[PDB]
């Protein structure tokens, strides 16, 4: 029980998740090339089903483009069994409205039939995890309808999303500010939690911490994969805090509608054995809570935290953890309404590339910087009816996108006001 079904939607979704699945297989002693057990450790059953001696990741692979799901057989192969691979028609793209309304009645039903199959095979659902782009086409459009549909069918099952916000440094497809809000609105309405990652921050991390002169899309995915792997780890490899997805919602989300979380991890490694010596708890905690490793274009030291959760993976002494975290409490302000809310935990199993790694999640009022930038881009295009009829013939009305903005603005305003004092 407390098992997790993972839904991967769109290109970004499938590549990030694919990298995730390879790392999680390594940690649990599963050879990703074919699912065979090597020496299996940890709570393998939370993410993999088991038939015979094969571990089968409980993934649903979704796209609209035939090629994107079909070609997973070449990039990851046997890692994702074909019964989970769903696509149709001729594909669709670069428009939220198209992904959301023109995916095909049959296409969505197939996705849901697969989701239900993964669910019925599971003793008890502890939640759903989705990986998707917040922009583009399929990841935001079809992915948001998928999010909506799942909650309607399973009203009490928490849903966590890892979602990637776009950046003009990477994509010229500037229709994006429209897509960004329509999906943000649905995340606000239907997810229990979401991890806000974006490529502006990931890009600058790649340039300054991984020392990459001109980060490729694959370097961004490398950092993302590390975040997902180490964040997810608190749920699956022992630990002193006994977490689950339902428990994370309880601990990190004090209010509904304010469930957007930042994530930060360190050390980062550029896809090779660059790791060295051992970091102390102090330098590692300092990196994690610094602004430089935040995987969202925020500057969290200037804000206030509603809640935070810090996991130490590896052989770290209790007394060093506590001194390092005391330093963090002194330096980074927290909202005193919650006399608790800063939970520190450790797990004895280290990540494959280091002696000790640290993961932090949290609710920081500066998370809205992402949303505020999106709003601004949107306003410049929207006040001019930049692209009214495109969206008009794909089934959305101006009132619906206005509803989407109103909700987004409400969330921004609530974060700024909620944490103004305490």
């Amino acid at each position: 029980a407390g098992e997790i079904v993972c839904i991967q939607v769109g290109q970004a979704g499938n590549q990030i998740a694919g990298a995730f699945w390879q790392k999680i297989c390594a940690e649990h002693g599963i050879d990703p090339v074919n699912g065979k057990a090597i020496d299996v450790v940890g709570d393998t059953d939370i993410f993999f089903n088991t038939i015979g001696d094969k571990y089968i990741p409980r993934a649903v692979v979704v796209d609209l483009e035939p090629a994107v799901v079909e070609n997973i057989r070449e990039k990851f192969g046997t890692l994702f069994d074909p019964k989970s691979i769903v696509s149709g028609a001729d594909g669709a793209g670069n428009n939220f409205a198209i992904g959301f309304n023109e995916h095909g009645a049959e296409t969505l039903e197939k996705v849901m039939q697969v989701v239900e199959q993964r669910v019925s095979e599971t003793e008890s659902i502890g939640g759903f995890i989705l990986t998707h782009s917040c922009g583009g086409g399929t990841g935001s459009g079809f992915g948001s309808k998928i999010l909506k549909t799942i909650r309607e069918r399973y009203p009490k099952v928490p849903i966590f999303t890892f979602s990637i916000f776009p950046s003009p440094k990477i994509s010229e497809t500037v229709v994006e500010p429209y897509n960004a809000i329509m999906t943000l609105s649905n995340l606000i309405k239907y997810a229990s939690c979401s991890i806000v990652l974006d490529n502006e921050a990931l890009f600058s991390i790649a340039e300054k911490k991984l020392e990459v002169e001109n980060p490729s899309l694959e370097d961004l995915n490398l950092i993302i994969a590390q975040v997902l792997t180490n964040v997810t780890a608190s749920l699956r490899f022992s630990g002193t805090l006994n977490l689950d997805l339902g428990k994370l919602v309880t601990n990190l989300v004090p209010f509904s509608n304010l469930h957007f979380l930042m994530a930060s991890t360190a050390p980062l490694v550029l896809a090779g054995k660059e790791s060295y010596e051992k970091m102390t708890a102090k330098e590692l905690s300092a990196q994690v809570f610094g602004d430089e490793y935040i995987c969202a274009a925020c500057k969290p030291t200037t804000g206030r935290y509603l809640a935070a959760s810090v996991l130490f993976r590896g052989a770290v002494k209790t007394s060093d953890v506590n001194e390092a975290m005391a330093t963090v409490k002194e330096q980074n302000s927290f909202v005193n309404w919650i006399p608790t809310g800063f939970k520190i935990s450790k797990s004895e199993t280290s990540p494959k590339d280091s002696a000790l790694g640290v993961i932090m999640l949290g609710n920081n009022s500066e998370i809205v910087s992402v949303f505020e930038r999106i709003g601004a881009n949107f306003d410049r295009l929207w006040s001019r009816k930049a692209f009214a009829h495109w969206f008009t013939d794909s089934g959305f009305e101006e009132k619906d996108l206005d509803d989407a903005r109103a909700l987004v603005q409400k969330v921004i305003d609530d974060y700024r006001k909620l944490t103004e004092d305490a």
Partner: protein, 422 residues
């Protein structure tokens, strides 16, 4: 034989069970799986049931809405003892919420739980009472323990019910909603327990850290301390004791003013990691340890506040001439409120434990419990006033008037305890 049924509810009730029952097994010469060895000593019937031939059965029920505490206890920690027929297993977590075990999920198990309880009751000619061991502040325990207790007392009203309430520490697996679950559940204990003992894991933590052993702390040390406390508290019910031969007598000796039934306890020796080497304790020292601050497993100092009742239950050879002269050293510390003209009761029972020449515990009905309550109540109010995390309970059925009522009953309880000091 006047017998007691023990119910283990939620994570700590069940994680403790293997240490508690292993200790009892050794005390009585039961060889862990129920096999008789040597000769039975003590009133074994009070805690173990008879197999048709030889074997002894712990008279227990294990209740956990999530399957994990029970599965490791019965498959890894103590085999062929906690018979699966008496385990009540759910397949979902509580997301740490009080509400889940009291209103929305745990309630569907009450038919099963009360049916199993009656089956235990029906095997015994003379019940003395019930003991419910549970974590307070952790939804499954915080919720079901009082739900179960209330269901029992309306069916068996003449029995004494005692609870062992364990408050989670902040360096262990606490939830950010601990203050809510804690007073939401104290509110029900206050109306259903006849005797309720509160043991604070933060004091266990502090004492061990003070000793210089914080880096050795793990669940196993906490479980050993908690299990020993249960064994020693319960010990006078297992032999021909002169102080408390029955839970019925405990009620009389410990709670003269029925609403104020919350007790604080102390122990000596404490055995961190079982490496303490308490080779010799003299009788005079044992009493000084029991009064001293660093052996009280609660955040109180005996030098402050007032007593309403105080029972010193020692084990092993403790000549009464020493006990009576030693007690005079408490003249400047142990002060009873002049509403109840009592005295410190002290006497001893035997040990079957070959490692300690002597040991003992105290049970205190002392106003300092009010400070544990006030700490939690202050946190409750601070969070409650900003609705932090309250949405999660409201959606499970906890109409908000419930939170207001809990606040009022605990503020009133605190006031009544402090009033004894004026």
């Amino acid at each position: 034989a006047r017998e007691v049924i023990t119910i283990h509810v939620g994570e700590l009730g069940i994680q403790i069970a293997p240490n508690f029952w292993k200790y009892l097994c050794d005390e009585h010469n039961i060889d862990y799986k129920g096999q008789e060895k040597g000769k039975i000593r003590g009133v074994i019937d009070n805690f173990f049931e008879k197999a048709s031939i030889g074997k002894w059965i712990p008279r227990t029920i294990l209740v956990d809405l999530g399957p994990n505490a029970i599965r490791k206890v019965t498959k890894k920690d103590m085999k062929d003892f906690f018979d699966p027929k008496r385990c009540v297993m759910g397949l979902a977590g509580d997301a740490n919420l009080f509400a889940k075990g009291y209103y929305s999920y745990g309630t569907r198990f009450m038919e099963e739980i009360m049916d199993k309880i009656q089956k235990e009751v029906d095997q015994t000619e003379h019940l003395q009472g019930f003991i419910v061991v549970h974590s307070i502040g952790d939804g499954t325990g915080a919720g079901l323990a009082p739900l179960i207790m209330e269901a029992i007392k309306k069916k068996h009203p003449k029995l004494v019910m005692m609870s062992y309430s364990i408050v989670p520490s902040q360096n262990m697996d606490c939830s950010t909603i601990l203050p809510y679950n804690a007073i939401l559940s104290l509110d029900k204990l206050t109306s259903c327990a006849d005797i309720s003992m509160i043991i604070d894991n933060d004091s266990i933590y502090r004492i061990v850290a003070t000793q210089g052993k914080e880096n050795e702390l793990s669940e196993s040390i906490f479980d050993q301390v908690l299990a020993k406390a249960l064994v020693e508290i319960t010990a006078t019910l297992r032999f021909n004791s002169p102080l408390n031969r029955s839970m019925m007598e405990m009620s009389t000796n410990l709670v003269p003013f029925p609403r104020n039934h919350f007790l604080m306890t102390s122990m000596s020796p404490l055995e961190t990691s079982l490496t303490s080497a308490h080779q010799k304790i003299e009788t005079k020292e044992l009493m000084q340890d029991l009064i001293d601050q660093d052996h009280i497993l609660a955040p109180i100092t005996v030098e402050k506040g007032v007593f309403t009742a105080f029972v010193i239950a020692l084990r092993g050879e403790n000549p009464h001439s020493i006990l009576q002269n030693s007690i005079k050293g408490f003249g400047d510390r142990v002060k009873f409120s002049e509403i109840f003209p009592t005295a410190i009761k002290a006497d001893s029972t035997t040990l079957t434990d070959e490692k300690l020449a002597r040991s003992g515990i105290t049970l205190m009905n002392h106003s300092g419990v009010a400070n544990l309550f006030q700490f939690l109540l202050t946190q409750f109010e601070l969070m409650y006033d900003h609705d932090a995390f309250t949405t999660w309970y409201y959606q499970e059925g906890m109409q908000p008037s419930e939170f207001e009522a809990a606040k009022n009953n605990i503020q009133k309880l605190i006031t009544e305890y402090k009033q004894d000091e004026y």
